[PDB]
């Protein structure tokens, strides 16, 4: 899992860069299109979750990380059970949602304003997308991606705190 391991290392210094320049990090990432945010959070469900409309730009980013993490956690839980049709169904559905969310996050990056932070986020996201589509992606690779997303979510939470206080 060389590629995902590279992303793990890059996350270590990218979270540092985000901490050093919280303003730049916000400019880099907090450019979500609200219509796309609502659609991604709903997925195939019959209802939009409460109060998404009142979420700030940074809060919408955090909500997308929350949902990606939730879906990836579920996919990891059932990874070894995909011999069963219904388990494979749920696994593929969740992996596809993670792919859609990460794709959207990558599309929101402002490179002119975001500079090195935006470059490194794009690289991390690209590695994740390439891994998610791999037919023979391993459970270990998915677990490392989960850790990356949790670490980055924590970074965004700190950015939010710094902007608001």
Please tell me the distance from the alpha carbon of residue 160 to that of residue 150, in angstroms, as a whole number.
Answer: 15
Name the nearest CA neighbour of 44 among 89, 107, 106: 89
Contact (CB, 8 A) for 88 and 82: yes
Positions of chain breaks in the chain, given as the residue before each break (C to N > 2.5 Å) = none
Name the nearest CA neighbour of 65 among 93, 41, 34, 94: 41
Q: Alpha-carbon Rg of the chain, whole angstroms?
A: 16
Please tell me the distance from the alpha carbon of residue 123 to that of residue 13, in angstroms, as a whole number.
Answer: 13
Instruction: Give the CATH number, domain containing residue 85.
Output: 1.20.120.340
What the block records as the tokens of 80 is 């070894």
Any idea which residue has 């907090």 for tokens? 30
Any idea which residue has 């993670």 for tokens? 98
Name the nearest CA neighbour of 96 among 61, 62, 55, 129: 129
Any idea which residue has 């059970």 for tokens? 81
CA atoms within 13 A on the CB side of 142: 26
Contact (CB, 8 A) for 42 and 48: yes
Contact (CB, 8 A) for 120 and 17: yes
The total of structural domains in the chain comes to 1
In which domain, by residue range, is 68 found?
1-165
Torsion of CA 78, 152, 65, 22, to 10 degrees: 180
Name the nearest CA neighbour of 10 among 161, 147, 111, 160: 147
Please tell me the distance from the alpha carbon of residue 50 to that of residue 95, in angstroms, as a whole number.
Answer: 24
Header resolution in angstroms: 1.8
């Amino acid at each position: 899992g060389r590629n995902v391991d590279f992303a793990k290392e890059m996350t270590e210094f990218t979270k540092y860069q985000i901490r050093m320049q919280s303003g730049v990090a916000m400019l880099a990432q907090a450019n979500a299109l609200p219509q796309l945010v609502l659609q991604l959070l709903r997925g195939a469900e019959a209802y939009f979750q409460n109060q998404v409309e009142t979420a700030t730009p940074l809060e919408q980013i955090i909500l997308l990380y929350d949902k990606a993490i939730e879906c990836l956690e579920r996919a990891i839980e059932i990874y070894d059970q995909v011999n069963e049709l219904e388990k494979r169904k749920e696994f593929v559905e969740n992996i596809d949602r993670v792919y859609d969310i990460i794709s959207a996050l990558k599309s929101f990056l402002d490179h002119e304003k975001g500079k090195e932070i935006a470059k490194n986020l794009d690289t991390i996201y690209t590695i994740i997308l390439n891994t998610l589509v791999k037919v023979d992606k391993t459970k270990e690779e998915l677990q490392k991606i989960l850790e990356i997303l949790k670490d980055l979510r924590e970074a965004w939470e700190e950015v939010k705190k710094k902007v608001h206080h």
